[model samples]
Target: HMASGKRGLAWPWYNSPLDPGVLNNGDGEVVAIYDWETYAPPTSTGGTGGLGFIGMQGTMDSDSSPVAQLATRQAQQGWATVFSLNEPDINGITPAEAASWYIEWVNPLAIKKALPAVTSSTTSGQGLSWLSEMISACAGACYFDYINLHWYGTSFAEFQAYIEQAHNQFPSYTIVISEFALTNGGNQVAFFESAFPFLDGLSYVLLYFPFVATSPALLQANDPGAVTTVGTGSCLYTNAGGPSSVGNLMY
Candidate 1:
């Protein structure tokens, strides 16, 4: 069955300047938000402007937000789902290490769980290879409902093929495209216009967030690398706090 509320905001910590309320205007399209952290957004009223908060333990443990406190943070936040590591496959964290860390921290959440987001790298022992190794390392002990993915490529055709390949690899697991965009900023409107319905039509695709959820100015100021890589055309907001061309597709 096609899922409702399958779209989300990949809200970053540096996205404080943008107003999430613009996307959560009750259209019901944008129903999820995450900030790659244990705490909810500061501007959040109860559930981050009524959008369901999906907590993320982006690191194994940081001085500010320890992985040991994951369960405590989830309980206090009352979020229904939790996303694990940001990008462990390429972050120097071995699959065996992540497997143990996931079992220790993420496994106890008692909520819907997604495996660490993996890149679309095709190199051996990276990307899906890394995720597969992590699962093997888990040895059937880890509990998860989704295989999270991140993709940055040239065309919708490439994106479609990658998504299909992931589903084929793990047919039993639902897929979440946690982050995706064109690498060099082609006609993004056309890209998402084609991408959205294609993703929404797939029953196995549970939730998908476009590359980002902030204005170009905020994105440039906070994550200049993103601008250089994906270009600002994919930003969801304008400097004036209104939806940008790409953001209009949310509703």
Candidate 2:
């Protein structure tokens, strides 16, 4: 939340569930929403708002989806930035192919742009290494403003080290942690308590979103598989339409 011009929501487009205006009110905390599918910011911001809407092109979307959204939004609404793929390194996309696709659609946005979000995988030719390849493949044609990332772990130390390592690897680029959380269940509030400050202290990290924005009950009801993979305890909201313990700190 300390990161200005960066703090925002990373909403899942499953049901178009999160009402940005509802969560983004007095706090002056949320500055953008990155759903890739949401072409416009919430109609009811409720106050003096600089809330921007960001778009993305996931592995599922054809090249056309991102292109059309970018054109329409830039021409009509005016976006602040755009995200690339969800996670090409882990989602079966090659660095070369991703670079080619990105140059074709995302590069022309003329606003801030991020590379595909990558996992924290240390395996050969994956994660940051994959991003490195994509950069090499771009060979200067691909213009990106940030290197997006995703991390899933329990401890603050591990998360910190991983992010620091990423900075070490790509020192020149700002980072956007689009998705992250401890898998299953483990002290999420405490985790963010430590993680937020650590992330806030870093000059390189532009923004980050804890795994999700929905209520635990909503998450369980909507994405059971995701629940199994990442427990509902990390959810920012509760069933009674209020902030959970961790969500309280998000603002």
Candidate 3:
């Protein structure tokens, strides 16, 4: 059942040392994974590693991976779902601009789709505010199955509150926590231990991914900015290519 497979991986392509299969563990607990692109991870056998591949457009357009290829890539991968922009709220893509771009590229796919993942910001023209503006700009034309969310806050309590608030605000749509983690160097394993069950119990939440699915060394080398913001506590792999304490909780 989809509900039983709520846990997912926020995979980054450069983390070659970490294998997604380590999280499978025969229980079908971790059932979905996404790199921030239309193409699946190269290591993913059958382009999905025997799990569901969720293709993401990530940007409005890039010379390398143009937005025009989104539907074709989805068709090629045969993925059932697709995620839109990564974090346009903070990336300088205005809400009105994204609405039209989404309509052009994202609307035609005959599969489950999520709005652009927004940061958990409370600013007037960012975060959920940006999402709201995009939806309003859509004028009921944008089609989507989920509201994608990303969060890096201090505690599980704050995370829970933010998710609940999102549910209250967008009661009609299912919620997908595409990314989340604690930013204060708290015990990440403890946070996930509490958070996984909490998210699983909420029927409104269709899927949830921890902040990342990479190792400490790889994350440090690839995204030093992330290391400074959230630290390496949330990485799902050990430096030795095995599941970390947080990754072990998937099962």
Candidate 4:
């Protein structure tokens, strides 16, 4: 596995890595694989080469209830860990609401859990403030295993400093940086070259998914909004289902 057994994959539903052959070729680095929803069982798929497959309750307003789905899936799949909501800080969900929902749905589950993923924004009512508010709302009731985070920046140093700041703020909890990448035409390959080793060395960092797992072509077709927002330079796959330039570094 890559670095601290920290290599994980996040597959968006719109256009994920349908070809497991590619993953087999070099993704031996992968220690975990995750979809926004519960996994369909990796064996039925080509499997992640015995990697840990994780599940996510990506949204509270999914067509089906994320709360109920995660509850039932936990019993069936019995994942050792589960990720909470996607980006509540930017997704219009209030911290108080998320705390109450987290306590009711996520806290009750008898598995390792993370708080709703937050962003780098330090503004009032957002980012760390949002998380801080949620913790206050929980008031010793939310039993989470880690603090989940997402970040998009322009440099590896900036990313490193941000994560260090987060660790400083939440010194007591382990951290899971589930989504992170350089944005705005950033040199992703170089960024990751520095990032991987740094994150690997951090004992407090349990896992990290590099923003996405799909190809540039797939990203363009499926998530046009993200293309304009997060930039597609960090995509880990090519149209031919092989690893992209940035992805090559993972192996």
Measured against the true structure, the TM-scores of the candidates, in listed sequence, are: 0.95, 0.88, 0.95, 0.91
lDDT of 3 at 114: 98
Worst 10 residues of 4 by lDDT: 40-49
lDDT, residue 59, model 3: 87
- Candidate 2: tens digits of C-alpha lDDT, residues 183-219: 7768878888888878877889888888777777778
TM match of model 1 to true structure: 0.95
The candidate 3 region of ten consecutive residues with least summed lDDT is 41-50
- Candidate lDDT scores, in order, read 0.87, 0.75, 0.87, 0.78
Q: Model 4 residue 216 lDDT?
A: 81
lDDT of 1 by residue, 1-251 (tens): 33367899888776655667788768677889888888886443333667888999989998656887889999998989899998898999999999999999899989999999999999878899999999999999999999999999989999999999998998888998899999874888899999999998899998999988888888888898998889988888888868899899987
Better of 1 and 2 by TM-score: 1
Report model 3's TM-score to 2 decimal places: 0.95
Ranking by lDDT: 1, 3, 4, 2
Q: Give RMSD (Å) of candidate 4 vs. truth.
A: 2.4
| Ranking 1 against 4 by TM-score, winner | 1
Task: Please report how far candidate 1 places residue 174 from its true position, in Å.
Answer: 0.4
